[PDB]
Scaffold this active site. Structure first.
Site, PDB file in Angstrom:
ATOM      1  N   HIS A 108       0.808  -1.217   0.000  1.00 36.08           N
ATOM      2  CA  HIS A 108       0.000   0.000   0.000  1.00 36.08           C
ATOM      3  C   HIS A 108       0.845   1.273   0.000  1.00 36.08           C
ATOM      4  O   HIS A 108       0.292   2.364   0.175  1.00 36.08           O
ATOM      5  CB  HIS A 108      -0.996  -0.001   1.175  1.00 36.08           C
ATOM      6  CG  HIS A 108      -0.377   0.205   2.525  1.00 36.08           C
ATOM      7  ND1 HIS A 108      -0.225  -0.818   3.437  1.00 36.08           N
ATOM      8  CD2 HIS A 108       0.088   1.321   3.131  1.00 36.08           C
ATOM      9  CE1 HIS A 108       0.329  -0.343   4.539  1.00 36.08           C
ATOM     10  NE2 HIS A 108       0.531   0.953   4.378  1.00 36.08           N
ATOM     11  N   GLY A 163       2.869   5.614   9.517  1.00 41.35           N
ATOM     12  CA  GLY A 163       4.237   5.552   9.045  1.00 41.35           C
ATOM     13  C   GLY A 163       5.062   4.414   9.604  1.00 41.35           C
ATOM     14  O   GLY A 163       6.247   4.308   9.267  1.00 41.35           O
ATOM     15  N   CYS A 171       4.283   1.143   9.177  1.00 47.31           N
ATOM     16  CA  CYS A 171       4.166  -0.055   8.359  1.00 47.31           C
ATOM     17  C   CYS A 171       5.507  -0.384   7.711  1.00 47.31           C
ATOM     18  O   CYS A 171       6.320   0.498   7.423  1.00 47.31           O
ATOM     19  CB  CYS A 171       3.080   0.118   7.298  1.00 47.31           C
ATOM     20  SG  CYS A 171       1.397   0.178   7.985  1.00 47.31           S
TER      21      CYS A 171
END
Ligand SMILES: CC(C)(C)NC(=O)N[C@H](C(=O)N1C[C@H]2[C@@H]([C@H]1C(=O)N[C@H](C=O)C[C@@H]1CCNC1=O)C2(C)C)C(C)(C)C
Ligand SMILES: CC(C)(C)NC(=O)N[C@H](C(=O)N1C[C@H]2[C@@H]([C@H]1C(=O)N[C@H](C=O)C[C@@H]1CCNC1=O)C2(C)C)C(C)(C)C
Lengths: 305, 305
Positions: B41, B143, B145
């Site tokens: 993503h 932030g 991930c």
């Protein structure tokens, strides 16, 4: 979201851990530039530790008597001296992994991460708090001495603790990196008594702010209190006094949530007088006091290094 | 002595963390040899994440579209492909800090350490457990991930988790390093429901052994029980069944203490039916289930890496 007891990244300190062997005793040392720091009771046998004369034990040791191993590599010792309760062993090689560092002596209530180590190799990281009675609730076994406690600020590792001994009830005591013990302790195996511990009030309040930030707000009441009134109630439950300096340090958390410190003090006064009635805060059934106000902001804002 | 939630040393994983930027999205990637692994993503805008078509979003991206930064150094991307929910970005440089590693898919109840990271830089370490409902109770912000969960065995870092998203009540969900989610989850921003969690019984029992090893023994009763009888009582309190495999894995702790597993089961049956009456075990007012039997032995015996 979420909130957990979080330790600093341990990489910069792993590169500094070495093994120090003198005679039949082995513990960990800290290799920074061309000096290895380690607790002085490495020059003891178990019979010496009951009542050691470290100055006399050390003068009968030579440089070659200290076997220092960085992994599988022996570091030749070319000098040694004693500073308080730590030995400084000078080696012929500077540690290429030496981070930017400073030696700090921390205050009670402040927190730091411990890198538990055995035979110069790391075993794990956990976060600790310097208790008001100058002890730490750690996890240490035989051979863990020389493990250090530290904070990281950007690129700078502040070394603040080196482990020396364990006291009754799984309680641990050590020195700063200049060899000075935290608290009224000496490095000999004879009866010594730690002081009465108390609860770090500014840290409980900071952890209640972490709870509000995470949506756990059931404990917030409609009241305020004066600072004198709160400190009177807190005293009965063995909480350290709250100072105006503590209120100022809570400022960032107070401003972010829009909850005045004294309003949060009012809610904590109710929790202490009424209990939690089987409820939990951030998953805990007891109030937590090993999160400083800085730790809460760091974890809730994502400060990196 | 002492017992604490202990994480693995994070050094070997810090050397692998990088920053991955595609368009206006930035998260962390894992650099191993000449490949960077990161959640897919990153190729999304916030409008795409409500219902993304990752295969279509990716075919409109070139190698130059992925900005990969190891510290202050840009790694030139020379190839990319999608595997399940992760992207594999091939770079022209092999990571000189690549540790010995393997990609593992762990089981529910097992534990691992998370290295929380923002913009390719580490923020902290904490230990987690893969819940029976295939979630983890972590601490993640926007932030984070690309941060990974891992175990260390001697010199080998087993990577077992990469973070993707957060669910109601501070609950986190991610994939293994082959991009397959743990549990019934997809990486899109629409209503999904995690299953009912339950308590990891073998871990509670292992933590009660850590308590005995540390001298906290008030909960030990004079009784034994059958395995069927215990599992009947445990069921009412949302505890997972205890299997003979679980009994065998508790063997080392049972043999060290001389307390048969079923005897310890008898004591836990009393704690569940009677409560703790305001007492604590290893400093906790609640029973803990995020220590595996291996973690207890590791911490109580001082296994290093
Ligand atoms: C009476 C009182 C209150 C003073 N306690 C006391 O004598 N404690 C002892 C102690 O800790 N000692 C004795 C000896 C060194 C230090 C030692 O063995 N340090 C270890 C480092 O390798 C780490 C330890 C090992 C277990 N967990 C740890 O943390 C010293 C020179 C002091 C002991 C009985 C627990 C062994
Ligand atoms: C409805 C349900 C139950 C599915 N939840 C849900 O939509 N959650 C969302 C979520 O987590 N998303 C949405 C988007 C990615 C993922 C995301 O933003 N991941 C972050 C990585 O950088 C980490 C996050 C940020 C906060 N804490 C974290 O852990 C995805 C492609 C799925 C959100 C509303 C919390 C933002």
């Amino acid at each position: 979201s979420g909130f957990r007891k979080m330790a600093f990244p341990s990489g910069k300190v792993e590169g500094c851990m070495v093994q120090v062997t003198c005679g039949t005793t082995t513990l960990n040392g800290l290799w920074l530039d061309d000096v290895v720091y380690c607790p002085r009771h490495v020059i003891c046998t178990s019979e010496d530790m009951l009542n050691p004369n470290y100055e006399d034990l050390l003068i009968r040791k030579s440089n070659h008597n200290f076997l220092v191993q960085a992994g599988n590599v022996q570091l030749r010792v070319i000098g040694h001296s004693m500073q308080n309760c730590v030995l400084k062993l000078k080696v012929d090689t500077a540690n290429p992994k030496t981070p930017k560092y400073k030696f700090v002596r921390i205050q009670p209530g402040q927190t730091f991460s411990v890198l538990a180590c055995y035979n110069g190799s790391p075993s794990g990281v956990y976060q600790c708090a310097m208790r008001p009675n100058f002890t730490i609730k750690g996890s240490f076994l035989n051979g863990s001495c020389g493990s250090v406690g530290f904070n990281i600020d950007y690129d700078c590792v502040s070394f603040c603790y080196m482990h020396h001994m364990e006291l009754p009830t799984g309680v641990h005591a050590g020195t700063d990196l200049e060899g000075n013990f935290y608290g009224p302790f000496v490095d000999r195996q004879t009866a010594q008594a730690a002081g009465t511990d108390t609860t770090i009030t500014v840290n409980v309040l900071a952890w209640l702010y972490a709870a509000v930030i995470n949506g756990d707000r059931w404990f917030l009441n409609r009241f305020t209190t004066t600072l004198n009134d709160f400190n009177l109630v807190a005293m009965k439950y063995n909480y350290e006094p709250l100072t105006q300096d503590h209120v100022d340090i809570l400022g960032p958390l107070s401003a972010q949530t829009g909850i005045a410190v004294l309003d949060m003090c009012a809610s904590l006064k109710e929790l202490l007088q009424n209990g939690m009635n089987g409820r939990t805060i951030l998953g805990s059934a007891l109030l937590e006091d090993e999160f400083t106000p800085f730790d809460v902001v760091r974890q809730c804002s994502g400060v990196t290094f």
